[PDB]
Symmetry: D2
Subunit: 247 residues, 4 copies
Amino acid sequence: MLTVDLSGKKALVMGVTNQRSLGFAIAAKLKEAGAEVALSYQAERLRPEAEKLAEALGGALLFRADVTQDEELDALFAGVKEAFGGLDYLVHAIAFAPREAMEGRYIDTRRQDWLLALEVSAYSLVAVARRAEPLLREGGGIVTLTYYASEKVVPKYNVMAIAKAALEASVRYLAYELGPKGVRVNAISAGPVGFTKMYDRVAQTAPLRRNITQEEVGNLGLFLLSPLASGITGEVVYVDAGYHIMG
Amino acid sequence: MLTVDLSGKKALVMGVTNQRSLGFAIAAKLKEAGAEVALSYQAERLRPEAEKLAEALGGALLFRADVTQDEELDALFAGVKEAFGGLDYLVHAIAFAPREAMEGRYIDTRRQDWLLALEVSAYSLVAVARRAEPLLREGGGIVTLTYYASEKVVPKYNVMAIAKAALEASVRYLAYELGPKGVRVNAISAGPVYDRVAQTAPLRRNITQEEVGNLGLFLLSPLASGITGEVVYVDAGYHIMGMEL
Amino acid sequence: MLTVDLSGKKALVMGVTNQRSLGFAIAAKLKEAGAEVALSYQAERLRPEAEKLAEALGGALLFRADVTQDEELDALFAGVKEAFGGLDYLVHAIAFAPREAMEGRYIDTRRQDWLLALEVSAYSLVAVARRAEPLLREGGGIVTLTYYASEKVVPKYNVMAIAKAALEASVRYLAYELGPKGVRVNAISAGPVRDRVAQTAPLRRNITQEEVGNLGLFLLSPLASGITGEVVYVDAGYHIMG
Amino acid sequence: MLTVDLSGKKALVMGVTNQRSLGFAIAAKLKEAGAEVALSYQAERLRPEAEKLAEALGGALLFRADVTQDEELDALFAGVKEAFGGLDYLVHAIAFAPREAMEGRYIDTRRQDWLLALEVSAYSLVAVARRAEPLLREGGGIVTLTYYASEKVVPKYNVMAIAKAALEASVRYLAYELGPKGVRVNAISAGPVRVAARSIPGFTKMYDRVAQTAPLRRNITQEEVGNLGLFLLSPLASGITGEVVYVDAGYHIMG
Ligand SMILES: NC(=O)c1ccc[n+]([C@@H]2O[C@H](COP(=O)([O-])OP(=O)(O)OC[C@H]3O[C@@H](n4cnc5c(N)ncnc54)[C@H](OP(=O)(O)O)[C@@H]3O)[C@@H](O)[C@H]2O)c1
């Protein structure tokens, strides 16, 4: 039997709200593999739930960070530096678009909403990669989360599709720029885990004839960060039961 | 002979600042085909440059609009409506990133530089598309410009590559949303208009401005009435190559 | 008014068996632009059909050649050389897969059926390109037809999808090899030509034969002189849909 | 600590001729994970080479089959059925194009060379997939090997690129057809690695290019391909099918 041993590795998972978050799933697997994981929550409303997740992970370090606030991000990676010394893995599981933009048509998207959506969902990767760069060790890695709508039109995904398009292009450039220093950057294109019409259609259309699970996304995230994927960087890997290959 | 007759057609061309731009080349070809063109220019300090461009096209309407200002875009489309009644073609050749963002690494892009680059280079297509929608007639079309760096890493392209990726995805969604009313949306992926391209490209040369112009013309013309949501490459085949030669 | 003047240009159109085909549409447009066209036909039992097509084009040269027979392909290109002196355009509209391969699952395709489908549908492009190369003049071009099943799974397309994937990769490599001599190679990815496609596509309709014709004409014309190694979609936007 | 326990799992590995192949690397990793492997070999003249491979894997079943011969593939899968009862994994590492096709230009490929390259390199996947289907258990998988030349022009790769393009499309369609029975199909797009690579005259200019151009500034190793093969076949990748995954040190993302 092969073992994935991440003892002594340090992990920061940003973007956690519930136990059903894809970010948590990756964290669960990372802790299971022996890593020290820290979580970061958006605002004070979610601290209680964040503490419950830390408990489920058998204990975890917590930070509050809003990705729109450069000051808060500065504080986060200062707290990480003090608490971990270095960093191995960074999970980027953050996305947002104003509700007003996620309804109706993409063409009707309002200026301030469009930018907010691109700021949180795409720029935040650049923001956190810059701050993690001097902390990241050899074999280190950043992984983000995206969706098929970046390449093909999925109605009602609107500006988020565009954000993901910007996210994935970011992944490639960051992979190119952090590669020399032994850091890998990849994206997980998850299937669904406005929504239910997409969820019940993947099940029917996808080759596996079902939806993917939260654990299946976790497993991919674990692998990509693990030394088992040491030759893999700049990739967008799909865990979607084969949906995206269907015409 | 087959003829492309675009007389009676009305076109709005945005983002053209010089005659050696790809946006100008498209405008030129539309004018050659018989269409009436209106140029937009960013600010009144650029009016003399805009007037030279109008003259070089053999006559063109001018309108002032900064694409980060919604009010001015409303004004421009009101002026286009009054002057033309409707619209057939919109050429989006606006591309900008702050100088600091383009110098150094992508990972070092500052927050507001990054947002501005995306605002001017990607969101502007959405902003003009929404305002053009009520003016656009059946068989009408929107065309924009993009580059290969959206899909593959081209160093020193930084945030523009990201903006272009956002732009191409915008083209797809706009093609879906504007399609039912007979409006097509497409992107032209132009090669550079440099030393390594000519050596690597299948054609063993760089493309010309006129070659981009011809594709722009084609895509907007009724000859391309089945084509929408596409990114079409005019790069002498360069992007199909897996190696530098 | 911009004009596309293709007078004095010589074209070879292969794979056309009926007037409602996409290959015919391109030929019609080439003829309309002023070019001389030569049609190929598979066997002598099909000459009556081939003559009808020539007449529909308002006159065209005919040559017999089966694309699985190298000897006949040599003869056809010798005939084309004799009759035209050189060649400007080659339209590859050949597509075939045995009926047994297209019925049932792709995984059940028989060896000889699978090979035959790829021979007629993909290798034929290589075979006719090699023979056209010495005839092709500067600014000359080759264009072929493909479908979106090459990239995405369209059930019941089976081995044709694979053939098209093989075809499109061939297009890229041929573009690279024939490029230095001023020859461009491109593919047209057509949507179907008439019900559900009409419901999903951005334009809310299917494409027409003429729309494929127009793209074919454009790609071969000097207006597309900077475009090579491409797969261009005429599908009313359909393939962009998730 | 997360463990990948593949004991009790049965694997068929096809197209392995040397220990320095990518197919061998996958087989080794499957063996390390606890699976039992059966190696196929083309002809009986190659039995000594096959035995050395079996020993290097720490023991493996051997079966003779030429993938262009439908009768022999029937025989091999009958033999695998008798010896294993069922199957979990199939590794497709078969790749061949005649020497004349790989020398010169793609446009000069002869008819029968072209067809043979496609027969051995692409159709063989369909052939073995059909026969593996009734043997394959839930959670089972097929993995094959491909490369970047399928999507972009890599000179001197010729018909192999076309075959790889035909192979990847096959992977998609096979993933759709074998999916309902819980079988996944995927392809590994490996960067250049220094035996089967020797039959490709455009490999080395690319090998030197990758180390300078790739984001990681090095070539990948055989073990890195092995690890991905193991991952894709393991239950850890149970949501992944119809995919082409790149292990190329990031090379193919570069413009
Ligand atoms: N779930 C799916 O069906 C699916 C499918 C494909 C891809 N994905 C991607 O997977 C990633 C994880 O999302 P999820 O679906 O698992 O849901 P999720 O974790 O509950 O939501 C994403 C996280 O981002 C956080 N966030 C939003 N704005 C933020 C800000 N300004 N500053 C800091 N954090 C912020 C959210 O906090 P708040 O809840 O407080 O806003 C939330 O914890 C997302 O990028 C998503 O696009 C999800």
